[PDB]
Amino acid sequence: RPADRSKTGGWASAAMILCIEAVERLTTLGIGVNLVTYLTGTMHLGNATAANTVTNFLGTSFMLCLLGGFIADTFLGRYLTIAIFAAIQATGVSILTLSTIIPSGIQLTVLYLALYLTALGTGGVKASVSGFGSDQFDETEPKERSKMTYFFNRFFFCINVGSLLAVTVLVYVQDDVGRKWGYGICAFAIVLALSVFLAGTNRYRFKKLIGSPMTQVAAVIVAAWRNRKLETLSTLTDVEEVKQIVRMLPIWATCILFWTVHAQLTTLSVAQSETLDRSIGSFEIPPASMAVFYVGGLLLTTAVYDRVAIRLCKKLFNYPHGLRPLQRIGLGLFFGSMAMAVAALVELKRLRTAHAHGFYLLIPQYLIVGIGEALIYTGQLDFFLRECPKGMKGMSTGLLLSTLALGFFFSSVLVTIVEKFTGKAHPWIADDLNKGRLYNFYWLVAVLVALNFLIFLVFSKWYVYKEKRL
Amino acid sequence: RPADRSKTGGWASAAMILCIEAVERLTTLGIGVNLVTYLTGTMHLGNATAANTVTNFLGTSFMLCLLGGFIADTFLGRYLTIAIFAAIQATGVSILTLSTIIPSGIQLTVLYLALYLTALGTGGVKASVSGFGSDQFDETEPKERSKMTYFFNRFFFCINVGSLLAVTVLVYVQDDVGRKWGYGICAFAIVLALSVFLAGTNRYRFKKLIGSPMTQVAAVIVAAWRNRKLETLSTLTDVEEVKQIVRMLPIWATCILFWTVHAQLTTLSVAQSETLDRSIGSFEIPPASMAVFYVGGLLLTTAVYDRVAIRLCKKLFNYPHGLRPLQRIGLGLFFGSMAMAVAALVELKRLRTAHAHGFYLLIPQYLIVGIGEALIYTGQLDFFLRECPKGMKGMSTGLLLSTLALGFFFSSVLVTIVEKFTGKAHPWIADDLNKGRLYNFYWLVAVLVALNFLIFLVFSKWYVYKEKRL
CATH class of the missing domain: 1.20.1250.20 (MFS general substrate transporter like domains)
Structure with a gap:
């Protein structure tokens, strides 16, 4: 008290x-x-x-x-x-x-x-x-x-x-x-x-x-239709403060898609696990215990990067952060599509042994994600932390939380849309992977995020221009 | 806020x-x-x-x-x-x-x-x-x-x-x-x-x-030892009120031996329950579940009194409740030894029968405790509320809880005392009570409570003669 x-x-x-x-x-x-x-x-x-x-x-x-x-x-x-x-x-x-x-x-x-x-x-x-x-x-x-x-x-x-x-x-x-x-x-x-x-x-x-910042971001959003009817510093320096966040949006929206490659990781890869070459010598490995390679892949990266960042910053003359303002964000996306396509190639490299007639097979997809994650996460964080004022800093973490949630909601959309794609015979989002297709879905995300990567670099040249010309 | x-x-x-x-x-x-x-x-x-x-x-x-x-x-x-x-x-x-x-x-x-x-x-x-x-x-x-x-x-x-x-x-x-x-x-x-x-x-x-009294009582005790070497309104009002709390004490001390009798119903009388005539037709009754007769005893003695209060208040010219101050406690203390007398008498009628070669037999004791409780409580509570200046009104529900807690400990002292002096060839409360002499442990309680309630009557005269003069 x-x-x-x-x-x-x-x-x-x-x-x-x-x-x-x-x-x-x-x-x-x-x-x-x-x-x-x-x-x-x-x-x-x-x-x-x-x-x-x-x-x-x-x-x-x-x-x-x-x-x-x-x-x-x-x-x-x-x-x-x-x-x-x-x-x-x-x-x-x-x-x-x-x-x-x-x-x-x-x-x-x-x-x-x-x-x-x-x-x-x-x-x-x-x-x-x-x-x-x-x-x-x-x-x-x-x-x-x-x-x-x-x-x-x-x-x-x-x-x-x-x-x-x-x-x-x-x-x-x-x-x-x-x-x-x-x-x-x-x-x-x-x-x-x-x-x-x-x-x-x-x-x-x-x-x-x-309690902020949204508190003001919404009065800005209410004045949308009182101005529609019309159609000192609260407008002189504060509306021009809200109009600075809307600029994160293209780059911010792009991120969402990585969290869907990260979602497919825990969902089907765990269901793919409950089939693949089980027995480990004497004992057996739990299906879901596969995410260890991602947790490992996550750990190892930031354990190595925060020891080799100096070696990146010295070879290429740079500021405190060893080439990660959004550079590390693009790298994550690169791996985002890698893990999905690898998981799609491997998906059938298991099937081309199941239809005509395992423990290591699912290790890449998880390992690629973890690395791609430690790179995209310490990138995303140290992006609008450095690209927003201190009264809006850590009210930038609000953009990280909406980024994640949106990617998991979008995986449900992504899976639901493909349910409304093929009904008769066997669809690519099955109950049995040894019968129905699935590699196709793993290719869809690999392409949807590859498309996103090209979509990201377009916003990369446009946002750098927004902080230098203006 | x-x-x-x-x-x-x-x-x-x-x-x-x-x-x-x-x-x-x-x-x-x-x-x-x-x-x-x-x-x-x-x-x-x-x-x-x-x-x-x-x-x-x-x-x-x-x-x-x-x-x-x-x-x-x-x-x-x-x-x-x-x-x-x-x-x-x-x-x-x-x-x-x-x-x-x-x-x-x-x-x-x-x-x-x-x-x-x-x-x-x-x-x-x-x-x-x-x-x-x-x-x-x-x-x-x-x-x-x-x-x-x-x-x-x-x-x-x-x-x-x-x-x-x-x-x-x-x-x-x-x-x-x-x-x-x-x-x-x-x-x-x-x-x-x-x-x-x-x-x-x-x-x-x-x-x-x-929330006092506890604070002021201790502060009064602080003065007692700092002025030990010597042997203004606080001397005239704070102490003359603290002296009033020293008054419930002999009444308070006597009630302790009620909760000793009460505790037996929850503990020792559950051993007299489990070993006696179990099943009721097709389905049996749990041993502990005998307390329904106690709970029922309380709840009834309460509802019955909360009608036949005015009936005895009009017969014998009383004020707000039917002889409910210290007369109320008395009944509970007599009914306290009463259940210890009854239960002992029924114990031998459970033991002397077992050597010669049940559910109904424990209904008396549970009720006698329940009846006596709703009387001792509407005595103990309706005492210091009216028997202490309003600065310490309900700041003596402790003078209720302290009577309980000690009553439980005094029974824990009682069981440990009987075991050391009477053990171990023929103990009263032993591992197998049939191969022990239980009934006489009650005569230690029954007569203790008969003697304790006797001193209560010896105090009740000296209280409305020494406190009423204030």
């Missing part, structure tokens, strides 16, 4: 608060990755619309985080949003466990509820836990500057370990050990982390946060 | 806050009444070892309630007490549910925590939910007073339904269905209410509060 006391508002906060961060982030992977294998095997839904289902939860998961961020900053507290939404997911992620214990009519209503309740909690929690660990920070930071970025960096390459573990350990517990423990532990994980965080309310110092 | 809002601070306060009170209430009985049965044949403890582990829990469950009430009245609010101590209990009971599904040296280590975690949680929740949901009260009260008092009697005889069902179905879900669901439903029940509570942190209005 009162004014700062350095003998209370300290690491105690950094500890308990960020417990939920690992707890939530690891649950989103744990649940997310393998939800496909449940909706298929356990839930009986058709492969085409068993994937479709998942994207929309993921799509929500982010659109909710975008929607919930505003609620956080503008309404009743960035603290309370953690408390309200950790309690929302704990309820949602426990109905999922009870959903794996009680008994597709009523069974779906409960499932889609439990999922879009976990899509709700995650959206609110993720939007604040990160910014509440931050609320510790100081003016010129006396010792805080070193105390902060030592723990936070010791916390980041700590959740990387856990993120590998959610794909590795938790998928084994879901596929082999039964989804009762699989989802059940996630339920326990969040209830524990809720008391831990709420035990800390005391050792915390709540900071006065300003 | 700013001020009074009749169009905002509303009935969700009533709706969404009190459910935790309701959940906790069904969670304390549902676990409290059983537990002994779980520690008998599931955890495998001795009849005198398991029933003693219960009295410490339930005592500490109020010793905390006394403390949590002080936390709400002085530290980081009445909303935060609910927010912290519900999640704690939801952590605690989920550990207890996980205690009944995972694999005694390290099994009790996990079970005792999950217990005393439900105790710390339960305590803080009880001592702040009721006091926060009632936040609807207004100065002169504009149409509020009506909705206010009605909602609570649409809640108090709502939680009276479910408390009766907690002895009925929840016990049957444990004793028959399995302690997995038993504590499992108990756990989900609290994780749902905690989500609902925090969510409606809008249609809630919080008030600024301070």
